Amino acid sequence: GRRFKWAIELSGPSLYPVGYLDKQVPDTSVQETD
Amino acid sequence: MPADTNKAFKTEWEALELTDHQWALDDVEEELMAKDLHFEGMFKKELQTSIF
Amino acid sequence: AKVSELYDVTWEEMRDKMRKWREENSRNSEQIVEVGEELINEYASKLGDDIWIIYEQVMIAALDYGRDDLALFCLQELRRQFPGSHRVKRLTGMRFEAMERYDDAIQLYDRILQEDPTNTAARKRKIAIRKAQGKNVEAIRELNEYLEQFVGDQEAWHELAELYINEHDYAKAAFCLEELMMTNPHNHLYCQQYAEVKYTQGGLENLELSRKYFAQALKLNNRNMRALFGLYMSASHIASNPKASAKTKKDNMKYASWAASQINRAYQFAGRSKKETKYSLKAVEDMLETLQITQS
């Protein structure tokens, strides 16, 4: 917005990383109490 | 000392399934209402040292 | 000042200062070689165990600064006592890379790997040779390969994050910084860098995440002004965006106004130091007044 005036906008253009995952896969719910 | 690699793998697999998640970051309001005097603290004692 | 400095020191203090420099792993090759060769000609009596690390450090600095003569002078002294030592081989390979003929250095690294299978330093130096020789993509692939084979080194994680910064890949750098912060939760520097990386990504939820991460590391050290500035602008940007709720925007304005007062006090406490600090206090005062008027 023009309110901030100076505002730099930065854009971004085989799965080797183990952690960075393409599919988000939420919906984890574990309830185990023994 | 992984005496039995597979058994240790399974034990850690179940231990990581047991543990829950509690985001300790969600409590940020405690710092919200506070005072900032330590940054006044060594700022006084950061003058005394010059540049070699 | 050179003679004046050399006069009001002792060898003990100089050696302790060099040890502190090693501990802080700073980049002061000029001063390192200035105090390095001075104690090699003045004392040159005892502390062999220390002076071997000193020899390696001085040659490392000379490789950076301008002087290969002293580098080879220390190389012969290192080779005199330990005939077979892989560290000296790595150092010689680094100097060879610095001069010319990178292929023979690569061959030396290959032989070193053939002798000792577990040699992280040689693989890191090869990864650095292909960082500067070819593109950064292949270097990224090989760094990932070595990291996967080890998953032990934090320096590898930070180097991967730094190389991904130039490619404008904040998604992968986010995971890199998350992993590097998980091992060290008390280091607010990594938290600040992660907050900046998440802020650069964009998005209101990412803005809130970066704001909270800024405020967490703000109480661990309680002095870093980069994080407080980032938090203030995160709150201002949250206020700017129309997609927000009334009470959340309200508390964001309170956060920004509180950060503004902390800025004012921080700059007012520096005004008694010198006589030119009043003018800088004025400057930040107009900045904060303009931002306050624009926010209000």
Next chain:
Amino acid sequence: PGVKLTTQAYCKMVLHGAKYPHCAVNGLLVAEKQHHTLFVDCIPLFHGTLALAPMLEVALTLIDSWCKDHSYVIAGYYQANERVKDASPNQVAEKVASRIAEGFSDTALIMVDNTKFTMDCVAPTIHVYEHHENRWRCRDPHHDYCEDWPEAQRISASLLDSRSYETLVDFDNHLDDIRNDWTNPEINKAVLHLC
């Protein structure tokens, strides 16, 4: 349109580049707003990673607050690459150039070379890029941007020979330590005295 700069700003730029020879450096030139483009002086922005907008916003807003205090205007922004065999403008540089070109109608992209960067500089060793909102990317072949060349060599040689360039302060050092300023008073005193 010619590009003219005072020896003070060039000495500041060279000196800031000398302060960190292993990482990329960043600077911002300032002109006077009231055809040739005259540059007054430059301020060093940051060093190191040099790919972050957050601190850039802080620094640029502070410079804007400064320019409305002594009636100044931000002229242009200059950047040097890390690798020696690199003389091509990065995307962040073009984005900042366009951001400054929205306001001012004359923003030159200054590139510090690395191949001709020694103690005894030959002379120009500066790449002037002329960028816009369109696809106009042209660099001037060779012109004269300094006022007096021999005097510039004498002062630059004296400044680089005598080790008195550790006092140069950046915006990052201002955040780390509020005490150091960022106008480089001692450098201004030295440039005036040497002349």
